[PDB]
Ligand binder design. Structure first.
Ligand SMILES: NC(=O)C1=CN([C@@H]2O[C@H](COP(=O)(O)OP(=O)(O)OC[C@H]3O[C@@H](n4cnc5c(N)ncnc54)[C@H](OP(=O)(O)O)[C@@H]3O)[C@@H](O)[C@H]2O)C=CC1
Ligand SMILES: NC(=O)C1=CN([C@@H]2O[C@H](COP(=O)(O)OP(=O)(O)OC[C@H]3O[C@@H](n4cnc5c(N)ncnc54)[C@H](OP(=O)(O)O)[C@@H]3O)[C@@H](O)[C@H]2O)C=CC1
Ligand SMILES: CN(Cc1cnc2nc(N)nc(N)c2n1)c1ccc(C(=O)N[C@@H](CCC(=O)O)C(=O)O)cc1
Ligand SMILES: CN(Cc1cnc2nc(N)nc(N)c2n1)c1ccc(C(=O)N[C@@H](CCC(=O)O)C(=O)O)cc1
Ligand SMILES: Nc1nc(O)c2c(Cc3ccc(C(=O)N[C@@H](CCC(=O)O)C(=O)O)cc3)c[nH]c2n1
Ligand SMILES: Nc1nc(O)c2c(Cc3ccc(C(=O)N[C@@H](CCC(=O)O)C(=O)O)cc3)c[nH]c2n1
Ligand SMILES: O=c1[nH]c(=O)n([C@H]2C[C@H](O)[C@@H](COP(=O)(O)O)O2)cc1F
Ligand SMILES: O=c1[nH]c(=O)n([C@H]2C[C@H](O)[C@@H](COP(=O)(O)O)O2)cc1F
Lengths: 508, 508
């Protein structure tokens, strides 16, 4: 009795594994993954058996795999005693003789093909499943991977990787039925004795109900989990709290999220995010534009709520024009401590330009620790339609010439603002990277107040029910001379296949 | 063959467990810990045996413990068949008969006393050790806990707790000799295939050599580990990088540290920290004082390096007086965007006072998400003797009326600056708490550039060789009317017993 694992690479949605007697994709890293995962052995005197259909055996060019014994399933092909590394069986179950005898075989893998995969699961010979999810969909498939039976649960999901602008993950499913103790007990007892006094009780591990894809425990690599687990922690430890809006939240303090921009783009796949709305807001910041109408003309309404007439009169800004938001983001970027009159005035030449000095500092003095962009001005706070949420950002040039970004955010809406903030500063870093001639680095976001508005509860619990899909890719179609020259047409979003969009009302 | 555990509470240094036939301390939580840890049983039909010396049996008033069978070791006391919950044995080894027979006993605990503890370890009957470390030292002990044999390694260290201004921990030692696999292998293989491309390879788990107290793996509760593990991560993944100083560092990006100020004070015990130097710098900030000499007069030299004549002339500030540092920390706190002349001028009335508006906002509108203190001013940056390291801080009022603090730090010296910054903002939060009538909350520090200067390598590796001791306590001797009225004499540091101070030269 030894282990039998399925190794397969299928499309993310339709699970297509092949077209016209070959692979729909060419990914070098995945073949090397197949090579290393099937060559994995504890005993040096043993080999691993690889079961595959005849057509699959044809697809590899009918040649043996090194240090492995290929088992071909065919009712046609002769059983050949010539090649010692290749053997043919008449049916799948008889090829499972590798269990009962032949102790020279340590582990068994099913390399499959649809016909083999389907009745390998159907007859339940499969202990484990190695799935490589690929982001190619709109192409054509004549061959698919059978839907994984409910007996399996994922124990692992890797980070998103990029090869030839194609995103892919690595997942491990296991067949689960059944089910040091000293430390677990002692901590629990201390938690009983001490109340909220013990800090371990102030941050509680989320209950399985609100924990996204609970079956994956030690195996969460994917950085969308960085957001989804923060979502869960707020649903668990969140204190019910009133705020300036009539809509109360559930708030916790001192949280963070890490993101990899090297091999992927941190855009949430559990909800369809409006990327155009995000970009057009970012280039709005970069241009230094405080005019709220310029966003609305482009059909981005996110700032309409804080850009109304009724809201401005309520905060004492009633003198102001309808959508004029005051010295907000991008004003403080391009002009710092500039005296603000209206949105129509020409502010060129006034105030400190941080974004300019930022870019200038990045390429001229990369190892400088002082690259910083701050939106928080105590003097201009009263003039703003709303104080900076993402307050300050620091940028870092790695020795391999990647550009990494840290962002502190004083107040964070996990339903609306956060999905935007994650992607927005991810784009900005990529923009700052191209202008300074760098590759994208890592994105880290630090959140002071992490909250969920009570009207988003039904929606965010829905979003948590969705198992994440690999991050998309974002490439620029041209290299601009100045960072202000970026246009929406220049952005190519590759392999984004999210879950249906979730509607959530903004608290004004 | 069942489990035998030692349960003991000893002083942190001299390991004294008792004085004059009783305990040197009275701690309610610890007795409840003893109660719950010795009442822990899997089977409801079984009881736990507690072995203790005669004098210890005297100390509890010679009365049985509920739901437990007390085993008293004496050569004098009669063996009494009267009380079924108490039994007397002539020697320790014969009392270990609980193993060979009497299956009504599930687990065995040694409640001890010095005479029992010493030859319980000496004859090696002890599988596990439950140690409660107490911060009382300078008092008198007639009874001690024997030095733990090298056969034991700690698997757990709890957070520091406070009872009657006394700090204490909870540790678990186990006797260790000997010594899912699928996930561990798959991740390793992906790490082989992909290079630094895989983000998991960019952040590597520290090698055992540079990992502080390696035996404690899943059991690190203590928040000094938050600093010590960050120390290790930099020693592992740190990129060698040049900077403005002639001394190069090893730098990583995007790190954080959490701290509990409720039950303890986050002051490093692995190195003796100068707390007076820290405080006098903080009250220096609070007063808004930019004069570097005022620190030197109080014999705090930390700013002397950046406060010299040669350093100022080097950065183009040569016009300035010797120790005048410009619009640095506390200037920007008390006066924001104030035009800076010299350190001697009277700045009262000019600039925005953040610290004032901060305190005013905290008690008037606690649930406000806008409490923020920023030292980073793009306009005044060129005038400063050095730009802000701890850039911005946000403060949070919990529903139970505790005050929690978040701090973003753009550049962090782990050898010198960080031990100061951790304690300094811990004090400031406690000060802001008293003025606004709150209890201390949690402290979270976010670090952009976490580095170790190459001259601190020998020192910081030494510091890593020291197993942490419970955090001290910090109490104020009086309640001030204004936050500026704090004096050094007002501070009482309770139960601080660090390792010897480690000298490290500041890079100028
Ligand atoms: N993305 C991935 O990981 C993988 C993709 N693929 C792709 O999928 C395609 C091939 O898959 P697919 O179309 O399903 O063909 P198969 O790879 O499953 O090959 C099937 C062959 O196996 C034999 N066979 C199957 N079932 C039985 C049975 N019950 N008894 C006896 N013999 C049996 C038959 O051979 P015979 O008729 O001669 O008796 C049959 O033609 C290829 O394009 C390949 O590249 C393949 C493997 C992995
Ligand atoms: N901090 C903590 O967790 C604990 C502290 N303590 C403290 O320790 C102090 C007392 O401990 P300690 O001084 O060590 O005294 P003990 O508690 O160890 O009691 C010793 C007695 O046990 C009997 N005994 C010991 N060894 C033998 C033997 N080899 N054969 C037969 N009988 C033996 C003797 O009694 P006899 O006269 O009959 O021969 C001896 O006097 C107290 O202050 C107590 O409160 C105690 C337990 C826990
Ligand atoms: C057609 N086919 C089946 C195939 C293709 N992709 C897969 N991808 C995955 N994730 N899992 C599979 N089971 C899988 N199977 C192939 C094709 C080539 C090789 C192959 O060349 N393997 C080499 C590896 C080549 C290299 O290192 O790039 C080896 O040594 O194992 C294997 C299977
Ligand atoms: C003198 N003595 C020995 C003693 C004292 N402190 C210790 N502290 C520790 N951490 N470990 C020990 N083994 C220990 N032993 C005592 C004194 C009182 C009780 C006691 O009252 N136990 C009650 C608990 C009391 C309560 O719940 O507050 C119980 O039900 O177990 C036990 C041992
Ligand atoms: N209470 C509150 N929450 C916020 O998130 C904000 C913002 C930032 C912001 C960010 C995103 C949106 C938003 O409309 N998100 C959407 C829709 C996006 C779209 O269609 O444009 C969603 O994902 O459901 C709206 C506002 C600006 N002002 C805000 N005030
Ligand atoms: N490169 C660099 N690193 C720094 O940490 C600083 C600081 C802040 C700072 C923080 C701590 C010290 C310091 O000397 N600390 C000491 C000595 C304390 C004392 O005896 O007063 C220590 O505990 O080891 C000196 C300066 C100010 N300027 C700095 N420049
Ligand atoms: O990028 C943003 N992200 C975000 O989450 N908000 C939300 C956070 C908060 O719910 C609201 C305003 O916070 P506050 O009322 O504390 O000023 O705006 C606003 C942004 F601009
Ligand atoms: O509180 C402080 N903490 C700290 O770590 N530094 C260090 C960080 C850095 O090593 C040095 C100067 O930062 P930089 O040269 O990058 O501007 O001062 C200074 C402080 F005042």
């Amino acid at each position: 009795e030894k282990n039998v694992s399925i190794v397969v690479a299928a499309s993310v949605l339709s699970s297509g594994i092949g077209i016209n007697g070959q692979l729909p994709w060419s990914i070098s890293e995945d073949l090397k993954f197949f090579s290393k995962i099937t060559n994995n052995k504890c005993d040096s005197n043993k080999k691993n058996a690889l079961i595959m259909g005849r057509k699959t055996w044809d697809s590899i060019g009918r040649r043996p795999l090194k240090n492995r014994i290929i088992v071909v399933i065919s009712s046609s092909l002769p059983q050949d005693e010539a090649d010692p590394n290749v053997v043919v069986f008449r049916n799948l179950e008889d090829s499972i003789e590798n269990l009962m005898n032949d102790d020279s075989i340590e582990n068994i893998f099913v390399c499959g093909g649809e016909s083999i995969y389907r009745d390998a699961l159907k007859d339940n010979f499969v202990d484990r499943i190695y799935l490589t999810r690929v982001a190619l969909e709109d192409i054509e498939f004549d061959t698919y991977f059978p839907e994984i039976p409910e007996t399996f649960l994922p124990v692992y999901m890797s980070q998103t990787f990029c090869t030839k602008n194609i995103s892919y993950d690595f997942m491990i499913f296991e067949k689960q039925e059944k089910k040091l103790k000293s430390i677990d007990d002692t901590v629990d007892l201390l938690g009983e004795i001490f109340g909220i006094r013990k800090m371990g009780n102030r941050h509680k591990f989320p209950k399985e109900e609100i924990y996204n894809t609970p079956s994956i425990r030690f195996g969460r690599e994917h950085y969308e989990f960085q957001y989804l687990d923060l979502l869960s922690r707020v649903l668990e430890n969140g204190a019910y709290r009133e705020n300036r809006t009539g809509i109360s939240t559930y708030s916790i303090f001192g949280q963070m999220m890490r993101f990899d921009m090297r091999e992927s783009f941190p855009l949430l796949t559990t909800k369809k995010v409006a990327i155009r709305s995000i970009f057009e807001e970012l280039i709005w910041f970069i241009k230094g534009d405080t005019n709220g109408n310029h966003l609305i003309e482009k059909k981005v309404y996110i700032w309409s709520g804080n850009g109304s007439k009724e809201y401005l009169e309520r905060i004492g800004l009633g003198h102001r024009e309808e959508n004029d938001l005051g010295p907000i983001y991008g004003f403080q970027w391009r002009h710092y401590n500039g005296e603000y009159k209206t949105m129509h005035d020409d502010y060129t030449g006034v105030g400190v330009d941080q974004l300019a000095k930022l870019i200038e500092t990045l390429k001229n003095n990369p190892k400088d620790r002082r690259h910083i962009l701050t939106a928080w001005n105590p003097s201009a706070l009263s003039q703003m339609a709303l104080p900076p949420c993402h307050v300050l950002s620091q940028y870092y040039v790695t020795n391999d010439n990647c550009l990494s970004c840290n962002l502190y955010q004083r107040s964070c809406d996990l339903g609306l603002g956060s999905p935007f903030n994650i992607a927005s500063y991810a784009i900005l870093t990529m923009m700052l990277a191209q202008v300074c001639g760098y590759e994208p680095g890592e994105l880290a976001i630090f959140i002071g107040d992490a909250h969920i508005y009570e009207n988003h509860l039904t929606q965010l619990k829905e979003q948590l029910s969705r198992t994440p899909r690999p991050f998309p890719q974002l490439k620029f179609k041209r290299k601009v001379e100045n960072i202000e020259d970026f246009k929406w047409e220049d952005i190519e979003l590759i392999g984004y296949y999210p879950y249906p969009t979730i509607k959530m009302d903004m608290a004004v």
